[PDB]
Design a protein around this ligand. Structure first.
Ligand SMILES: *Cc1ccc(-n2ccnc2-c2ccccc2Br)cc1Br
Ligand SMILES: *Cc1ccc(-n2ccnc2-c2ccccc2Br)cc1Br
Lengths: 7, 225, 225, 7
C-alpha cells in the first residue's frame, strides 16, 4: 500500500 | 561537485527542492555526503527527500511500462522498460553506495543510524520491486529493516516519527515484497497501538507529527483488512 | 539515437509520454527528426508536447529561483538560477536548431509550415523571457509568429486549432514580452470573434477542438480587461 | 497569461 511519502 | 563548498551544496539542495528540481537536489546532496562529514538531521532529510522523489518518478514510469509490457504478452516496450529499470537500479545503487561509504558506519546516534538503515531497506526494497538474485535482494532489505527496528525499539519512544516511518515501510515490505501480509498487518497494528499509548507524553507539535504517520498505518490497515 | 529505427523512436516517444518521461520523449523525437524525413501531423504533435513539457519545467524552476533572487536583492541563488537558465537556453537552441535543420524549409503545406513557425516563435519567446540581444531575440519571435499568422490567414479557416493556438500564443507574446497589451487584447478579440462566426461549419468533434481554444482566448481577455 | 498548454 502506502509507504512514507517523503515530503 | 568536488569544487563546491559543502554549505553551498546544502543551500542549493534547498533551492532545488523549492524549484521542484529533484535530480539537481539529489546531485547536490550526493556532493554534500561526499565531503565526508556526518549529516545533521535536516541534511539527512534533504538527502532522503531528493532521492525519494527521483526514484519515485522512475518507479512510477517503470510501473506504467511494465503494465503495457504485460498487456502486450515488437521489442520496443521491453527495451524501454529495461532502460528505465537500469536507470532506477543505478539510482538505488548510488544511494546504497553513499550509505555504505560511509554514512552508516559513522552513524553512532540512534536517530542517525536508524534513519540510514531505514533508507538502506527502502532502496533494497525498490531493487526488489524490479528483480526476478531476487531472494538475496529481498534478504538485504529485510536485514537492514530488522537492524533498524531492533535499534529503534531499544533507543526511541514508540511515537518517534523515524521509528513510526520505519515500521510503516517495513510493513509495506512484508505485504508487497515478502508475501507476508499477516506479518505486515501485525506490525502495523502493534506499531499503531503502542504509539497511541504514548501520545499523552507529547507536545502539540510532536503530537501532530506522530499522528500523521499513525494515520498512514491506519490507512494501510484499512486497505489490508 | 542514430542506431534506432525511426518507427521505434516514434513508438518509444509515445510510451515515454504515457510514462510522463518527457526528457526521454524529447530525445526520442529529436532522434526521429534527425532521420531527415518530414513529420506527420501526429509526429509534429509528439515533438511539440515533448519539448513543451521539458522547457515548461525549466521555466517554472527559473521563475521560482528568479523570485528568490529578486527577494534577496551569497552567490548561490544567482549561480543556480544561472545554471537553470543555461539549461533552458540549451533546450530552446536545440528545438530552434531542429526547426532550422531542416523542418521549416521542407514544410510546404500550410498546416506543417504554420505549426513549425509557431514553434519557432514560442522558443524565441522562451529565450526572451530570460534575456536582458534581448531586442533581437524578441524580434526573432515576432518575425516567426508574423509569418505564421500571414500564412494561416490565407490558408486556414478561422477555427483551425493550429491557427487559433498560434493567435493565442502571439497574443501572449504581445502582452508579456513586447509590452503591447492593447495589441494582445485586439488580437485575442478578433481571433475569438472570427472563430465564433465560423463554428457553424464544423462537425461536433471539430467544434469541441475549436471551442476549447476559444475558451483560452476568453480566459486571457478576462484577465487582461 | 495562458499560452496553449500542450497536452
Ligand atoms: C522515514 C521518515 C519518517 C519520518 C520523517 N519525518 C520526520 C519529521 N517529519 C517526518 C515526516 C515525513 C514524511 C511524512 C510525514 C512525516 Br511526520 C521522515 C522520514 Br525520511
Ligand atoms: C499550438 C497548438 C494548437 C492546437 C493544437 N491542437 C490540435 C489538436 N488539438 C490541439 C490542442 C492542443 C492543446 C490544447 C488544446 C487543443 Br484543441 C496543438 C498545438 Br501544439
Amino acid at each position: 500500500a502506502g509507504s512514507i511519502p517523503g515530503r | 561537485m568536488g569544487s563546491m563548498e559543502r554549505a553551498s551544496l546544502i543551500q542549493k539542495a534547498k533551492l532545488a527542492e523549492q524549484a521542484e528540481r529533484y535530480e539537481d537536489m539529489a546531485a547536490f546532496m550526493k556532493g554534500a555526503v561526499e565531503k565526508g562529514e556526518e549529516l545533521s538531521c535536516e541534511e539527512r532529510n534533504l538527502l532522503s527527500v531528493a532521492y525519494k522523489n527521483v526514484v519515485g518518478g522512475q518507479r512510477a514510469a517503470w510501473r506504467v511500462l511494465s503494465s503495457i509490457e504485460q498487456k502486450s504478452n515488437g521489442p520496443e516496450v521491453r527495451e524501454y522498460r529495461e532502460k528505465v529499470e537500469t536507470e532506477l537500479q543505478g539510482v538505488c545503487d548510488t544511494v546504497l553506495g553513499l550509505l555504505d561509504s560511509h554514512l552508516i558506519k559513522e552513524a553512532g546516534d540512534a536517530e542517525s543510524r536508524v534513519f540510514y538503515l531505514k533508507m538502506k531497506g527502502d532502496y533494497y526494497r525498490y531493487l526488489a520491486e524490479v528483480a526476478t538474485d531476487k531472494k538475496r535482494i529481498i534478504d538485504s532489505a529485510r536485514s537492514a529493516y530488522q537492524e533498524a527496528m531492533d535499534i529503534s525499539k531499544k533507543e526511541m519512544p514508540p511515537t518517534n516519527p523515524i521509528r513510526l516511518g520505519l515500521a510503516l515501510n517495513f510493513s509495506v515490505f512484508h505485504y508487497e515484497i515478502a508475501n507476508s501480509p499477516e506479518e505486515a498487518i501485525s506490525l502495523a497494528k502493534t506499531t499503531f497501538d503502542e504509539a497511541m499509548a504514548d501520545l499523552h507524553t507529547l507536545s502539540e507539535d510532536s503530537y501532530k507529527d506522530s499522528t500523521l504517520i499513525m494515520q498512514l498505518l491506519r490507512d494501510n490497515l484499512t486497505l489490508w483488512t
